[PDB]
């Protein structure tokens, strides 16, 4: 599961919170930690270095190190990770969601903004959204090309600890109207 030091920090934050807005920050942080926890376990399965929100220009400079960083027309996107293999750039983003809604938003955006730099570099750029459903624990990957690259991708984890911390948060703030309708 998640780190013991990380778990206790959430538990301390929940026990000291008295205010809805602080409680919603803990809620958004639980989602971020849950996402990052998935990323690290996924990256282990894919045998790639764990990364998060890496600037696209740093990706171009890694795969094509002769490119002038001062004068390259690159998109201003920060994908979770990438894999450059057989002159194909796979742009990876981690998702933890019961819905594909957030996947379609990220795909449509990353696809549209990588067409030009793909033409410029003469490198095909494949957008790979890797989503785990946190209930079913099923792994859904859009990219056929990415799935043909790898053996069947298995990320055998659960989010029971995240569910538990969220449950404690709602024990304490479940009757706070300001918390229940808090966005942050
Ligand atoms: O890196 C991400 C990102 C993802 O890669 C993602 O898959 C889902 C969501 N993301 N993001 C979320 C985020 C990420 C993970 C879990 C919950 C949240 S909830 C709002 C929020 C994010 C990041 C910072 C922040 F201050 C936020 F309030 C932002 C959005 O766009 C830029 C980069 N990014
Ligand atoms: Mn990200
Ligand atoms: Mn992500
Ligand atoms: Mn695997």
Residue numbers in the entry: 0 to 183
Report text from the authors:
In La Crosse virus, an orthobunyavirus, it has previously been shown that the cap-snatching endonuclease resides in the N-terminal domain of the L protein. The L protein serves as the primary effector, showcasing its multifunctional nature by encompassing both endonuclease (EndoN) activity in its N-terminus and RNA-dependent RNA polymerase (RdRp) activity. During cap-snatching short capped primers derived by endonucleolytic cleavage of host mRNAs by the EndoN are used by the RdRp to initiate the synthesis of vmRNA. The determined atomic structures of different EndoNs show that they harbour a conserved PD…D/ExK catalytic motif in the active site and bind divalent metal ions (Mn2+ or Mg2+) that are critical for catalytic activity.
Crystals of the LACV EndoN–baloxavir complex were obtained following the same procedure as for the L-742,001 complex in the presence of 5 mM MnCl2. The crystal diffracted to 2.2 Å resolution and was processed at 2.64 Å resolution in space group P6122 with four copies of LACV EndoN in the asymmetric unit. The baloxavir structure can be decomposed into two linked tricyclic scaffolds, a metal-chelating scaffold comprising an hydroxypyridotriazinedione motif and a specificity scaffold comprising a dibenzothiepine moiety. One conformation allows the side chain of Asp52 to coordinate the manganese ion Mn2, and the other is in an open form that moves it away from the active site. The chelation of baloxavir, as observed for the chelating DKA motif of L-742,001, occurred via the three coplanar O atoms of the hydroxypyrido­triazinedione motif that bind Mn1 and Mn2; each metal ion displays octahedral coordination with proteic catalytic residues and hydration shell [Fig. 4(c)]. The chelation and specificity motifs of the ligand adopt the same conformations in the active sites of the three molecules. The dibenzothiepine moiety adopts a V shape and makes contact along the Met31 side chain, as for Ile38 in H1N1 FLUAV PA-Nter [Fig. 4(d)]. The chelation and specificity motifs are positioned similarly in the two proteins, despite the absence of the N-terminal end of helix α2 carrying Tyr24 in the LACV EndoN active site, which is responsible for the locking of baloxavir into the H1N1 FLUAV PA-Nter active site. Three molecules of baloxavir were placed (chains A, C and D). The F o − F c density of chain B has a lower quality, making it impossible to locate baloxavir correctly. This is explained by the double conformation of the Tyr49–Phe55 loop containing the catalytic Asp52 residue and the high B factor of Mn2. The R 1 position facing His34 should be substituted by small alkyl groups to reinforce π-stacking interactions, the R 2 position offers the possibility to introduce larger groups and aromatic rings to target inter­actions with Leu30 and Arg33, and in position R 3 there is still more space to extend for buried interactions with Leu30 and Val27.
